[PDB]
């Protein structure tokens, strides 16, 4: 059972690769279509291309499960289109054997895909959003999306972007006298936290009362807590964080007593992704390729896309609802995966 | 004439089924988001049915042409598979004649989406906007807690206050931080106050006066600053979609001309996609009636999304109001023309 | 009339499936086209119907070149086509199947269109199923109303594609009867099929193509006596 | 070994396609199945192969009921199937077509798999195309390697689907020769086709089912002399 297993293995493998190629191409195409309302004449089509193509290694990982479902459907769809699968099972080979032969290249592309997306996606993505924001509207005291406003005593602080590395980007320090006269307005590009104090870098403090001094190194005057929940409201979504970053952050707010369940959920959708994909395509292969009736390839891929979008909606509703009611995050991703798995098993026994 | 009513009835009933499916889908997702918002903050629990009822034309507007696309694709695919179109054109039916027979329902649906797009969208978004503006002008908690630090949409302006009054129209300890529009007047403006008093207008918006404050129009780290010692200062703040209003034709405002071009552009888009789907339904090889459906939906999204992109760049990019939208419609028109005249170019070049 | 196909040649990825095949078929005679599957029989027949565009060659109906124009033009010239698969309007009745195509005829009036509708209905004895839809008819009745529609286009030639495909031995005689009906109207008939016995039994001047080139021609006995066709197609053991 | 299918019946939404069809096939004999298309001729064969699940009835191969098992279960019980369409593994060569299924055989060894591979390769005259892929073969070679795999599954019965359909009259003798080879190997053979002449020429005990019920059975002469099959199937003008 080596020649058939390598046959379906290579077929499903190259099928998943091609599907990922086309889907990634269309995704980048629409991203470029959508990023055409943002040009401020500072940088447009070129910075667009740089942003999109730096985001391609990220988007490939987000596309890997769908490319795996559709890919397996293209493999077994092309094999069953030429009547090879019907006679393959008409000779003693059960359907479960075919499901495993299809699932091994999937497990290879998912186990290999999670470390590719986690080692290559966060870096290229950080460069992408960083450069895009900087040329688009970065360095400004004001930041799009969300920037943190806080008041300490008679001092007003705005943060352009809080990164989950303990670094604050775009720190404005508005220091008025009691009389409200601005005795100093300052700006800092980045800030580092070290034990007892906040140490700012690339700082520019300007005021003209009886100069515009520029200090590049630490300034420590924040007795404010700048609480980890206040900062936690402004952290970027756990999508960009590495898997290890999700673990260390999960355990970062756990020590502070802050709750960390969204990050547990993303952690488990990240770690158990080959499993939920394996169950999804198990149920799909069982349901679509089960009956002996000949089905065209477009109908197979179409109905499988319907399955993938339906269960996609299922997890999308079942996550927020999983943690608003404070359940364990593991069963959140395990229960739908086990439903697709057991449904695929019962469909296998139906045949 | 039996062919006319035959293909016309098939196309109309098929596009009606597809538009019903897509309509239930979109209305169910948007319903999940509106019931969601109605569960998160208990916003309008009773009349969310009325909210969706106002959102119906805005969805049917964009759903109807796609339903026509996949309608003629599915129905004509049916006729090609079962050899009906073969013996149809084997008798003397030119593909031009097929494009006319198909083009009459395109005119009907073009009128339906025309009156719906011109009339029912500004009305539905108008009523939805008035209800939303009342139940949200007193339920959207747009007024401060007082709390601190309220921000608008982008984050350009920030209003901060320590106290609200009985009339929820007095203030105390005010500070505002705003930018204007861009390149011009790049400086950030900040105002500080002891006492302020907010006045809201029955029509909408809010106007507030602050007493004995200060005014600054300079950037934190540039050393260019101005001080304005005042004792009374009245600011008119904006509002707590806005463009879908009424059908006032293209005037001095370029945004109204653009929106008129888009609302007017949807039926022409119906005609264009109708031209696309007549030769794109040649699935005679009897191997794929569901195959072109995904490229049809995705390509149609490449029509709609790109049209929205150039419509967005129509106002700030100074694309003359005779070039842009007709440039898009001309692109996809060129696609349809090419697809239609693929074979006549072979036959006429052969001569 | 006179249908002519002179020096047909098709190139298929370095492979010449059919090269320099010339045949002619006149109105009122039943002409067959047979040979091995790899030969130019399959591609050449479509090159006559117009489904497959001929890379090189001439196809003219009655001194009028009809080769490289669309299929509907060939239909106006008089060339009708009848595929093997179900081609009935499943949603239209029999009277709607015949009238629907009768309305396309240029030279008619409502008296002529209804007269032709009733004439074709009572001609093929399908007057009792004039209300039954396409999907409700059986196979024989389906082919019957298909032939009725083909006559409703008023052609000078008809190209039958696999007539004796999937047909019971009891219905082959009915097929012979309806094809003789078509012959009695002075309309040419071209038949291609794998049922060589009945095909040659009904065809007057059949052609035989092998490995791209025409290898034989003539009546049933002339082909049964040809040694090359016995070498490559019929076999020394057939009949 | 003797396969029996007792009281098969398939119902299609108020129309009973097959009622009370019983058939038996012994190892080493060629059994045919014929009849009209609307009859249970087509559906019964599928109910035996396992492609169509029988609503009610018994299907047993040598005392082992195979009715409510998957098609692969019938395959392990000994039921092999050979469809008419292309069933070749187009991307792997012929030797991979036979060896790929030979590796699934429980009762073999690596020496045994190579010996059986060579035996089937030189046995079916496919020894020269050991390098050609599936998609590269012609029709005859296609069917040869298909039958080669069918025997490579080591079945006790083989269910051929339209063997004589679309074969040139020169190849009919080759098909009969290979089916006689399958006869000489002690494996049952079920043949269904529309070419009644060649099937009855090669089948020993053919069956005829009409409108659901079995109407005839017996030898070629018993069927040619049977009056019902000439009334509803053969058409009084057979041979």
From TrEMBL, chain A:
Its main location: membrane. Pfam families: LptF_LptG (PF03739). It is found in: Cell membrane. It comes from Pseudomonas aeruginosa (strain ATCC 15692 / DSM 22644 / CIP 104116 / JCM 14847 / LMG 12228 / 1C / PRS 101 / PAO1). Part of the ABC transporter complex LptBFG involved in the translocation of lipopolysaccharide (LPS) from the inner membrane to the outer membrane. It is a multi-pass membrane protein. GO terms for molecular function: ATPase-coupled transmembrane transporter activity. Keywords: Cell membrane, Membrane, Transmembrane, Transmembrane helix. This is LPS export ABC transporter permease LptG. InterPro entries: LptG, LptG/LptF_permease. Component of the lipopolysaccharide transport and assembly complex. The LptBFG transporter is composed of two ATP-binding proteins (LptB) and two transmembrane proteins (LptF and LptG). GO terms for cellular component: ATP-binding cassette (ABC) transporter complex. Belongs to the LptF/LptG family. The keyword Transmembrane applies. It comes from the Bacteria. GO terms for biological process: lipopolysaccharide transport. The chain crosses the membrane at residues 7-33, 63-82, 94-116, 271-289, 301-318, 330-348.
Automatic annotation (TrEMBL), chain B:
GO terms for biological process: lipopolysaccharide transport. Its main location: membrane. Keywords: Cell inner membrane, Cell membrane, Membrane, Transmembrane, Transmembrane helix, Transport. GO terms for molecular function: ATPase-coupled transmembrane transporter activity. One of its GO terms (cellular component) is ATP-binding cassette (ABC) transporter complex. InterPro entries: LptF, LptG/LptF_permease. The keyword Cell membrane applies. It is found in: Cell inner membrane. The chain crosses the membrane at residues 12-32, 52-77, 98-121, 260-278, 290-310, 322-342. It is a multi-pass membrane protein. It holds the Pfam family LptF_LptG. PANTHER family: LIPOPOLYSACCHARIDE EXPORT SYSTEM PERMEASE PROTEIN LPTF, SLR0882 PROTEIN-RELATED. Part of the ABC transporter complex LptBFG involved in the translocation of lipopolysaccharide (LPS) from the inner membrane to the outer membrane. Component of the lipopolysaccharide transport and assembly complex. The LptBFG transporter is composed of two ATP-binding proteins (LptB) and two transmembrane proteins (LptF and LptG). Belongs to the LptF/LptG family. This is Lipopolysaccharide export system permease protein LptF.
Automatic annotation (TrEMBL), chains C, D:
Part of the ABC transporter complex LptBFG involved in the translocation of lipopolysaccharide (LPS) from the inner membrane to the outer membrane. Probably responsible for energy coupling to the transport system. The keyword NAD does not apply. Component of the lipopolysaccharide transport and assembly complex. The LptBFG transporter is composed of two ATP-binding proteins (LptB) and two transmembrane proteins (LptF and LptG). This is Lipopolysaccharide export system ATP-binding protein LptB. GO terms for cellular component: ATP-binding cassette (ABC) transporter complex; cytoplasm; plasma membrane. Belongs to the ABC transporter superfamily. Outer membrane lipopolysaccharide export (TC 1.B.42) family. The keyword Plastid does not apply. Residues 3-236 form the ABC transporter domain. SUPFAM superfamilies: P-loop containing nucleoside triphosphate hydrolases (SSF52540). InterPro entries: AAA+_ATPase (IPR003593), ABC_AA/LPS_Transport (IPR051120), ABC_transporter-like_ATP-bd (IPR003439), ABC_transporter-like_CS (IPR017871), BCA_ABC_TP_C (IPR032823), LPS_export_LptB (IPR030921), P-loop_NTPase (IPR027417). It is a peripheral membrane protein. GO terms for molecular function: ATP binding; ATP hydrolysis activity; ATPase-coupled transmembrane transporter activity. PANTHER family: CONSERVED COMPONENT OF ABC TRANSPORTER FOR NATURAL AMINO ACIDS-RELATED, LIPOPOLYSACCHARIDE EXPORT SYSTEM ATP-BINDING PROTEIN LPTB. It comes from the Bacteria. Keywords: ATP-binding, Cell inner membrane, Cell membrane, Cytoplasm, Membrane, Nucleotide-binding, Translocase, Transport. It comes from Pseudomonas aeruginosa (strain ATCC 15692 / DSM 22644 / CIP 104116 / JCM 14847 / LMG 12228 / 1C / PRS 101 / PAO1). It is found in: Cell inner membrane; Cytoplasm. Pfam families: ABC_tran (PF00005), BCA_ABC_TP_C (PF12399).
């Amino acid at each position: 059972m080596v020649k058939l297993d390598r046959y379906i293995g290579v077929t499903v493998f190259v099928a998943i690769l091609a599907v990922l190629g086309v889907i990634l191409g269309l995704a980048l195409l629409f991203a470029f279509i959508d990023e055409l309302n943002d040009i401020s004449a500072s940088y447009g089509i070129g910075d667009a291309l740089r942003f999109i193509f730096l985001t391609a290694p990220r988007r490939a990982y987000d596309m890997l499960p769908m490319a795996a479902l559709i890919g397996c459907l293209v493999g077994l769809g092309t094999l069953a289109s030429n009547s090879e699968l019907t006679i393959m099972r008409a000779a003693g080979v059960s359907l479960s054997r075919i499901v495993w032969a299809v699932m091994k290249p999937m497990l290879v592309l998912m186990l290999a895909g999670i470390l590719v997306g986690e080692y290559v996606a966060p870096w290229t993505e950080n460069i992408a959003q960083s450069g895009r924001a900087l040329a688009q509207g970065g360095g400004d005291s004001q930041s799009s999306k969300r920037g943190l406003w806080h008041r300490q005593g008679r001092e007003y602080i705005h943060i352009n972007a809080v990164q989950p590395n303990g670094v604050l980007y775009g720190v404005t320090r508005y220091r008025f006298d009691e009389q409200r006269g601005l005795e100093s307005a300052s700006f800092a590009k980045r800030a580092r936290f070290e034990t007892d104090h906040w140490q700012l870098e690339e700082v520019t403090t300007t005021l003209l009362h009886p100069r515009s001094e520029v200090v590049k190194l630490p300034t420590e005057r924040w007795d404010a807590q700048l609480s980890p929940q206040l900062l936690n409201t402004v952290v970027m979504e756990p999508e960009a964080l590495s898997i290890s970053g999700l673990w260390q952050y999960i355990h970062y707010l756990a020590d502070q007593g802050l709750n960390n369940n969204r990050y547990w959920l993303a952690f488990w959708t990240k770690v158990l992704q080959p499993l939920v994909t394996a169950a999804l395509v198990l149920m799909a292969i069982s349901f679509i390729f089960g009956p002996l009736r000949s089905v065209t390839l477009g109908q197979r891929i179409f109905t499988g896309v319907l399955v993938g979008f339906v269960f996609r909606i299922a997890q999308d509703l079942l996550g927020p609802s999983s943690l608003v009611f404070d359940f364990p995050p593991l069963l959140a991703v395990v229960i739908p995966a086990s439903i697709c798995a057991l449904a695929g098993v019962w469909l296998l026994r139906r045949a | 004439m039996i062919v006319f009513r035959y293909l016309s009835r098939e196309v109309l009933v098929t596009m009606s089924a597809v538009s019903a499916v897509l309509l239930v889908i979109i209305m169910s997702g948007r319903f999940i988001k509106y019931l969601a918002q109605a569960a998160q903050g208990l916003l309008d629990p009773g009349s969310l049915f009325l909210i969706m009822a106002f959102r119906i034309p805005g969805f049917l507007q964009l759903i109807l042409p796609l339903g026509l696309f996949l309608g003629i694709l599915l129905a004509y695919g049916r006729l090609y598979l079962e050899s009906e179109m073969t013996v149809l054109s084997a008798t003397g039916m030119s593909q031009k004649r097929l494009l006319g027979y198909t083009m009459a329902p395109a005119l009907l649906v073009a009128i339906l989406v025309a009156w719906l797009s011109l009339f029912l969208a500004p009305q539905g978004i108008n009523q939805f906007a008035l209800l939303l503006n009342k139940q949200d002008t007193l339920t959207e908690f747009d007024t401060l807690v007082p709390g601190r630090f309220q921000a608008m949409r982008d984050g350009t302006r920030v209003t901060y206050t320590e106290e609200l009054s009985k009339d929820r129209g007095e203030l105390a300890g005010i500070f505002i931080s705003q930018k204007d529009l861009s390149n011009q007047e790049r400086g950030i403006s900040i105002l500080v106050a002891e006492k302020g008093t907010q006045n809201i207008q029955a029509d909408g918006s809010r106007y507030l006066i602050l007493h004995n404050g200060y005014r600054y129009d300079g950037n934190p780290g540039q050393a260019n600053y101005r001080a304005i010692q005042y004792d009374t200062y009245g600011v008119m703040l904006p509002k707590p979609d806005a463009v879908p209003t009424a059908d006032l034709f293209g005037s001095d405002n370029p945004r109204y001309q653009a929106e008129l071009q888009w609302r007017l552009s949807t039926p022409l888009l119906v005609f264009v996609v109708t031209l696309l789907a007549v030769p794109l339904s040649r699935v005679n090889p009897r191997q794929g009636r569901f195959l072109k459906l995904l490229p049809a939906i995705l390509l149609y999204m490449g029509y709609l999304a790109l049209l929205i992109a150039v419509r967005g760049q129509l106002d700030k990019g100074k694309i003359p109001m005779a070039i842009g939208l007709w440039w898009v419609h001309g692109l996809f028109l060129a696609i349809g023309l090419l697809l239609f005249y693929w074979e006549p170019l072979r036959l006429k070049l052969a001569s | 009339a006179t249908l002519k196909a002179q020096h047909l040649a098709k190139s298929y990825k370095g492979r010449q499936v059919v090269r320099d095949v010339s045949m002619s078929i006149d109105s009122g005679q039943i002409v067959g086209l047979l040979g091995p599957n790899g030969a130019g029989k399959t591609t050449c027949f479509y090159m006559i119907v117009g489904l497959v565009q001929a890379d090189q060659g001439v196809v003219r109906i009655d001194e009028q070149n009809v080769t490289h124009l669309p299929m509907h033009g060939r239909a106006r010239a008089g060339i009708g086509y009848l595929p093997q698969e179900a081609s009935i309007f499943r949603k239209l009745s029999v009277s709607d199947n015949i009238m629907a195509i009768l309305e396309t005829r240029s030279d008619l009036d409502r008296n002529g269109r209804k007269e032709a509708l009733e004439g074709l209905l009572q001609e093929f004895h399908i007057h009792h199923i004039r209300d039954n839809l396409g999907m409700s008819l059986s196979g024989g009745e389906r082919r019957r109303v298909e032939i009725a529609r083909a006559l409703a286009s008023a052609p000078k030639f008809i190209l039958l594609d696999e007539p004796f495909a999937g047909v019971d031995p009891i219905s082959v005689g009915d097929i012979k009867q309806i094809i003789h009906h078509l012959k009695a109207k002075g309309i040419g008939i071209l038949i291609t099929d794998h049922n060589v016995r009945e095909t040659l039994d009904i065809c007057e001047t059949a052609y035989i193509v092998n490995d791209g080139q025409l290898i034989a021609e003539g009546d049933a006995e002339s082909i049964l006596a040809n040694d090359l066709v016995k070498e490559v197609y019929l076999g020394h053991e057939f009949r």
